[PDB]
Design a protein around this ligand. Structure first.
Ligand code: 3Q6
Length: 276
């Protein structure tokens, strides 16, 4: 089945910068023929070769192409010119989940519940494909125009067959990740929605890591009891004992947790999100 001919830079009107890393930049672009907006990731080939990042770039192109689900940023197309690679990605108009955390301070139980539920539902899909994110965080959990999540940033994903504050203990005591690594990250993110801050904080990276391996953190007095219980079943040193992992029999027990009592799991992206 014939695909549309290769696109090129001149097919777009480029606008503002949407995101920045030291090897790539995401720019908003409007396709002239359609007036559609895309988030185009631009990568300079020479810099990526120089910095030995080719495996990461390929990894992301491969992963983001196979993902077909509303809670994931989609890769629509790729092209390149003499110097640059272009990835046409979903444009998540409302930006980072991190922004909303900073904006409103900390979520109420209704919003925490709904967004956690979406995240859990996205991970179930992802893990179902034998893919592990490895760098899940509020920065790359984006929000669509409709205020549903869209997860992105897959260069560091692992196909089976990170950021200091969200790093799992196994990554510090063995250097080997699994699906439970994502579930640990999830426990950190839930904590952050409720409290307004990540669980493991310190003056520098070394001190942060030191806290992780000791499981040194605690709950504010004001912290939804059932959310606290859930977090405590995710933030567990033993990776095989995190709710949701294969050795704990997967996503059934996770979705059945009392914190999610009122959630309808089947059609989350069709539900109207709670107002922030
Ligand atoms: C830009 C930084 C660094 C980057 N790191 C990288 O490319 O690392 C390599 C090793 C070179 C592969 C990962 N970044 C991203 C960022 C976005 C993104 C950002 C905003 C968006 C919006 N508003 N709509 N859509 C969006 C997609 N999407 C992906 N996929 N990645 C974040």
């Amino acid at each position: 089945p014939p695909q549309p001919r290769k696109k090129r830079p001149e097919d777009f009107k480029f606008g503002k910068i949407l995101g920045e890393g030291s090897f790539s930049t995401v720019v908003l672009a409007r396709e002239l023929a359609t007036s559609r907006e895309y988030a185009i990731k631009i990568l300079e080939k020479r810099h990526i070769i120089k910095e030995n990042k080719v495996p990461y770039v390929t990894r992301e192109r491969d992963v983001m192409s196979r993902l077909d689900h509303p809670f994931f940023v989609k890769l629509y197309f790729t092209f390149q010119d003499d110097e640059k690679l272009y990835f046409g990605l979903s444009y998540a108009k409302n930006g980072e989940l991190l922004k909303y955390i900073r904006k409103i301070g900390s979520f109420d139980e209704t919003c925490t519940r709904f967004y956690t539920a979406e995240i859990v539902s996205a991970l179930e899909y992802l893990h179902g494909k034998g893919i592990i994110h490895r760098d899940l965080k509020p920065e790359n959990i984006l929000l669509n125009e409709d205020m549903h999540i869209q997860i992105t940033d897959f260069g560091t994903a692992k196909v089976l067959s990170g950021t200091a504050q969200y790093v799992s203990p196994e990554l510090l005591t063995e250097k080997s990740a699994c699906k439970s690594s994502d579930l640990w990250a999830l426990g950190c993110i839930i904590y952050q929605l409720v409290a307004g801050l990540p669980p493991f904080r310190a003056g520098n990276e070394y001190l942060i890591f030191q806290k992780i391996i000791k499981l040194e953190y605690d709950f504010p007095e004001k912290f939804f009891p059932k959310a606290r219980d859930l977090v405590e079943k995710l933030l567990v040193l033993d990776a095989t004992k995190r709710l949701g992992c294969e050795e704990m029999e997967g996503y059934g027990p996770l979705k059945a947790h009392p914190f999610f009592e009122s959630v309808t799991w089947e059609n989350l992206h069709q539900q109207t999100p709670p107002k922030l």
